[PDB]
C-alpha cells in the first residue's frame, strides 16, 4: 500500500552525481552530430519521430527546426503540389503540423480514388503506411474531411489487419497501441517505459539515442519522486485523511494526473501545483457527494462564493476542515506568484474554486430535484464541473504570462481551450466507464447503448477536431506549455479508462528501469 | 554567519540514541531515592532549589509537592507563626509560593526591628541568609510592605558587602548575578550553561544530580536546535528576508525570544510558533518604520482591518507582501488549530493582529502629528505594540484550554497579565537600553516621557522607570496567583517569561546566543 511511510522510503540520491549529467550531455552532442549529417528527408523525419516518440524533444528544437523549416520550404509550404508517396506526406503533415507549421490536407488529395470519396485501396497493401495516415489523420482540425476520410479508410484497413494475423508481433504490439489510443490521444511521458522498451526492441534502433532515452528516464523518474515524496508529505502533515474520514487517501493517484501534464524536463512547481489543486478538486467533490441536504451544500457554496474568513463560522466541522484547507492553499499559491511574479492573483484563484463548487452545486441541485440532464445540459455542466478550468486558470498565473486585465478576463471566460480540455475528459471518462453521457443520450433520444456509445465517440473525436483549432489560433491568450497541459488532461483521462492502472502508476513512478 | 546553510548544518541526531534516554531515566531515578531519605527540611528545600536552578522541576513534581507539603503543614501554612530562622523562613517561603502555596509575608514579622520600620541590622552579618532574602523579597505581591523593606535591607547589604569585597569567588559571581536581576526575573532555561558550570564548582554538588542536569541540557539543545532548524527553514522558503529589502535576516534572534518562553521539555510546537509570530511582528514594525506617510500607513492598518483578500489590491508592493504572508500564516496556524483543538480561532487571530498594528498606528499618528505622548500614554499604546497580547492570545488556543465565549474574551480583554507581560518587556529595554545607549544623550522614551512630563532630570526619570518595572512585577504576581484566570499557568509562564527574556537582553548577546544554540556543553 501506497503509504506515506512508502513513498519516503526510496532515495532520491541514485542520478544526482555529476557523471550523470556529464554522460547525458555527450549523449546530446552525439546526437546533434547525427541529426547534422546529410541523409534523406524521410530519414530525418524518422529520426525526430523516434526521438519525440523517447520524450527527447527538449534537448534538440534548434535541429528539429531547421530540418523541418527545410522540407517545408521545399515542398512549397505543403500547400497544393504533391510532397511525397503515402508514408512521407503522412509523416512529414504530422510532425510539420505539430512543430507549427501551416500546412494543407490537399496534400493527400494525390492518394484518392477517382471520384474523391475515399483513398485508394491499393494503397492500404502496405501497413506501415496505412499506419502513418491514421496517425496523421488525428491532427485534423475543423472542417478538414480529408482527414476524417483518411481516419475512416485507414482504421477500417488496420482493423483487418491485425484481424487476419500480423506475424510481426512488434508491429502488432504497436498497431493495438494505436488501434486503442492514437499517438496524438497519448502522452509520452505517461508511457516512457512502453515506448523505450519498443524502441530498444528494433532491430533498426540507435544504441546512442537508446542510451539517451534510458538516462533521461533515470533523471526524469528521480526528479517526480522527489516531487511526490513533497506532495505526499504535505498531504500527511494536513491530516485531511484522518479529519475527512470519508475522502479516500489516493495521493499518487493525485500526483499521476499532475506528472504528465507538462514537458518534464521543467515545471516540477506547476506539476506540484496541479496535484494539489487535483487533491482539493477531490475532496471538495467528496464533500458535495457526503452530505445528505441540498441547504447544507448551499451553505458550502456560498462560503466559496465570500471566500471570507467569516464564512468559517456558518459551516459544520467538516465543511470547516475543508473550507480552510482550501483556503489556506489558495493564499499560499497567491503568496508564491505574489514572491516570484509580481502579481497579486487571489481574486482569480477564487473565481477558479468558484466555477466548480457552481458545477459541483448544480449536479447537486439536479440530484437533490430527482432531475436527470438532458445531454446538452449534463455536457455543459461537466466542462466546469470535471476541474480542467480549474486547473489550468490557476497554473497561469505561475509561468510568465501577462496579467493585463482584459488578457486574464479572456483566460477567465473560460477560454475555450479550457472547457475543451474538460469535455474531453469527461467524455474519456464516461466512454470508459461505459447518469453519464451515453445514458444521457439514451433517455433524450429512447436510444440504444451502442447508439449512445457511437455518438459519445463521435463527440470525443469532435471535441479532439475543435481543440485541435484551437491550440493554432495565433490569438490565443495562452502559452504553448498551457495549451499542451490543458491538453494532456484529457489525455491521461484517456488513459486512465481507455487503456491494470494501479500497476502501470507505480511501475512508472517507482519501478527502475533496467 | 548564521545563515540558513549553518544553520541546516548540524545534526540532530546524537541523543536520540536510545541509551541516552536510558541513562536519563536511571539518574532521574537515583534522584527520586535521593529525595525520598530522610533528611532536615533545610536541606529537603536546598536540594528542591538545585534541582529546580539545573531546569528539572519536570521530573520531580510529585517529589517536590510532597515534601513542600509537609513543610507548609508543620508551620501551620505559613500564616502568623515563626517558621524557622532567617534563611530557613526565606528559602521555604519563596519555594512555597512559587509552587502555589498560599503562604503570608507576616512570617518576615520575627526578623524586624523595634518600630518595625526595618529589619535586624544584626541579620545582615550572614550574606547567605541576606541573600536568601533578597531573592525572596522578588515574590512581593500588591499590598506586601514587608518583602519592599526586605529588598531595600538586603540589596543595601549585599551591595556593601561585594563592595568591601567579598573571598568567596563562585559566591561572589553568584551574588554579582543576583544584584543584576533575582532569580525570579531570570529564565532557567536561557541560563542553563550558566547554572551547570556554577553547579559544577559547588563543594557539595552531587555527581548524579550534576549529570542529570547534562543529560537534559544535551537532549533540550538538541531538540531546540531541530526546531530551529524547522523555522530557519520555514523563513528562508519564505524568501521575505531577500523580497523585503528594509527588513534584517534575524531569525535565529526571534527563535532565541521563544526558547525561554516555555517548559522547556514540551511546547515544541508553541516556541516555533513563538518564533514565527515575533518574526510577523519585526517584520510589520518595520513597515511602519520604512514608509513614509502617514496615508501609508492607513492603508496597511486598514488592510488589517479588514482582514479580506480585496484589501491586498489597495497596498504597494512590499506592504502586499508583508499582509499576504502574515494572513497566509493566520489561515496556516488557524487550520492546525481547528485540526488539532477542534475551535474555528481565524476571527480571534485577527484580533490579536489588529490590536499590534493599531499600536503601531497611534505611534505613527503621534510622530506625523509632533505629538510627544504622557508616559502614561507611551505606556499605555506601548503595552500592546510590543507585542506580548498578540503572542500569548494566540498561543492560548494552540492548549487545550476553554474555548467558551466569555473565557476567550476575559483572554481579550486583554487579560491584564498580557499587557503587563507587555509592560515589563517594553520598561526593561528603554531602561537598559538608556543605560546602555548606542549613542550619548540619547534617552530611551519612558524616561524621556518622564522628564518631559515633570520636568526630571534624565537620572530621575530613570529611578522611576526602575521604580515601575519592580511595581509591574509585583502586579504580575498578585495576577499570577489569582485564582479565577483565564490563562493556565503554562501560559502565564510563558507571559512572564516574555519580560524577562527582555531582562536578559537588556538589562544583563550574540555570543550568549550562539553558546546557549549552537555549542556543545562538555
Redesign the interface.
Given at each position: 500500500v501506497w503509504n506515506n511511510d512508502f513513498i519516503q522510503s526510496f532515495s532520491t540520491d541514485k542520478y544526482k552525481d555529476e557523471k550523470f549529467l556529464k554522460k547525458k550531455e555527450e549523449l546530446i552532442a552525439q546526437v546533434k552530430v547525427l541529426l547534422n549529417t546529410k541523409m534523406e528527408a524521410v530519414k530525418q523525419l524518422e529520426l525526430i519521430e523516434d526521438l519525440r516518440n523517447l520524450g527527447l524533444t527538449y534537448y534538440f528544437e534548434d535541429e528539429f527546426k531547421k530540418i523541418l523549416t527545410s522540407i517545408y520550404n521545399e515542398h512549397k509550404g505543403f500547400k497544393n503540389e504533391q510532397v511525397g508517396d503515402l508514408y512521407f506526406t503522412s509523416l512529414a503533415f504530422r510532425l510539420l503540423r505539430l512543430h507549427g507549421f501551416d500546412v494543407s490536407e490537399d496534400v493527400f488529395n494525390f492518394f484518392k480514388n477517382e471520384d474523391g470519396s475515399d483513398f485508394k485501396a491499393s494503397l492500404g497493401e502496405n501497413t506501415k503506411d496505412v499506419l502513418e495516415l491514421y496517425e496523421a489523420s488525428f491532427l485534423i482540425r475543423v472542417g478538414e474531411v480529408t482527414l476524417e476520410q483518411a481516419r475512416v479508410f485507414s482504421t477500417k484497413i488496420l482493423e483487418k489487419k491485425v484481424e487476419e494475423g500480423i506475424k510481426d508481433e512488434k508491429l502488432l504490439a504497436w498497431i493495438q497501441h494505436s488501434l486503442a489510443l492514437p499517438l496524438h490521444w497519448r502522452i509520452q511521458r505517461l508511457e516512457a517505459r512502453w515506448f523505450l522498451d519498443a524502441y530498444k526492441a528494433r532491430k533498426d534502433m540507435n544504441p546512442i539515442i537508446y542510451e539517451l532515452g534510458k538516462i533521461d528516464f533515470h533523471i526524469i523518474q528521480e526528479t517526480q519522486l522527489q516531487e511526490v515524496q513533497e506532495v505526499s508529505q504535505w498531504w500527511t502533515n494536513?491530516?485531511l485523511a484522518e479529519?475527512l474520514p470519508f475522502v479516500r487517501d489516493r495521493i499518487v493517484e493525485c500526483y499521476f494526473w499532475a506528472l504528465g501534464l507538462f514537458e518534464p524536463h521543467e515545471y516540477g512547481y506547476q506539476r506540484k501545483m496541479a496535484a494539489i489543486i487535483i487533491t482539493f478538486v477531490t475532496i471538495i467533490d467528496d464533500v458535495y457527494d457526503v452530505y445528505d441536504t441540498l441547504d447544507e451544500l448551499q451553505l458550502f457554496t456560498d462560503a466559496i462564493r465570500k471566500?471570507?474568513?467569516?464564512s468559517?463560522?456558518t459551516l459544520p466541522?467538516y465543511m470547516?476542515?475543508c473550507y480552510?484547507?482550501v483556503?489556506?492553499y489558495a493564499?499560499?499559491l497567491?503568496?508564491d506568484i505574489?514572491?516570484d511574479q509580481?502579481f497579486?492573483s487571489?481574486?482569480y484563484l477564487?473565481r477558479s474554486w468558484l466555477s466548480l463548487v457552481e458545477g459541483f452545486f448544480q449536479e447537486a441541485k439536479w440530484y437533490y430535484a430527482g432531475y436527470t440532464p438532458t445531454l446538452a445540459e449534463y455536457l455543459e455542466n461537466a466542462k466546469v464541473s470535471i476541474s480542467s478550468p480549474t486547473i489550468i486558470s490557476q497554473v497561469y498565473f505561475t509561468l510568465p504570462n501577462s496579467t493585463e486585465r482584459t488578457v486574464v478576463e479572456n483566460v477567465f471566460g473560460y477560454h475555450n481551450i479550457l472547457y475543451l480540455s474538460g469535455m474531453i475528459l469527461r467524455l474519456a471518462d464516461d466512454l470508459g466507464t461505459t447518469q453519464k453521457a451515453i445514458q444521457c443520450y439514451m433517455n433524450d433520444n429512447n436510444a440504444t447503448e451502442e447508439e449512445g456509445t457511437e455518438h459519445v465517440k463521435y463527440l470525443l473525436r469532435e471535441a479532439w477536431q475543435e481543440m485541435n483549432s484551437a491550440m493554432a489560433d495565433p490569438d490565443c491568450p495562452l502559452s504553448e506549455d498551457l495549451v499542451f497541459a490543458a491538453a494532456n488532461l484529457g489525455r491521461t483521462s484517456q488513459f486512465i479508462y481507455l487503456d491494470e492502472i494501479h500497476n502501470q502508476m507505480g511501475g512508472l513512478i517507482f519501478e527502475p528501469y533496467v
Open positions: 494536513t491530516n479529519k471566500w471570507d474568513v467569516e468559517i463560522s466541522y470547516q476542515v480552510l484547507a483556503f489556506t493564499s499560499e497567491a503568496y505574489l514572491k509580481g497579486n487571489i481574486s477564487q
